[PDB]
Symmetry: C3
Subunit: 91 residues, 3 copies
């Protein structure tokens, strides 16, 4: 019920929130990196399968490719946007 107690709790709240921001940023960066690796490998093996198909026909099957660039960029943008969610209290 004291102004001092309220002020201390407020600083605690802001500091814990700010601490969470950095951790969530790292998790977003690791998720984007994992998606990039997945795209690389899936497309490489799709290309191997396609090459195998046509090299076997040199002597019906639809291979598909993956594009996750937009989602990965949205994750990077979230990282930069969260940079702007930090709390800077007055006083």
């Amino acid at each position: 019920v004291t102004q001092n107690v309220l002020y201390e709790n407020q600083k605690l709240i802001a500091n814990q929130f700010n601490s969470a921001i950095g951790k969530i940023q790292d998790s977003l960066s690791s998720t984007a990196s994992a998606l990039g690796k997945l795209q690389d490998v899936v497309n490489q093996n799709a290309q191997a399968l396609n090459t195998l198909v046509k090299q076997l026909s040199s002597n019906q099957i639809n291979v598909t490719f993956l594009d996750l660039e937009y989602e990965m960029k949205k994750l990077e943008e979230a990282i930069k946007k969260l940079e702007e969610s930090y709390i800077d209290l007055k006083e």
Copy 2:
């Protein structure tokens, strides 16, 4: 001071809401990426299986596996929905 404490409380709420929105967006794009991954991986598993089948009717130990991420994608959508309940509306203060 009472004034400044209240302004800080509202700043805290606004920053928190903006972070929640950005995190919801990130979760949406992760679920969308996961769905695309499932579609493409299963389509190429089908292609490999069809190649095996057409090769054996012209070995039977080649095992193709398929992916089901739909429980995880639904959990990401649920997280979005639940974070929607964590918003603090200024009228709540």
Copy 3:
């Protein structure tokens, strides 16, 4: 506008923040699980393709199959869950 309302709002804010942190930890858990499932299926279909290429080459030098290792990213997601555990707010009397 009144210190008692400020105190109540402070408790409301802290509880919504803690609940959001829990939801975010859950989303990270389900993302790590989806990533592990993806690695399993992608590598199993890679090995299936490689086995097919070898059995046809013993029946193709240019065909390269690659494998996926997401272990660093998955450990970093588990790490984010663990660190976020230290971000909870314990207000007191």
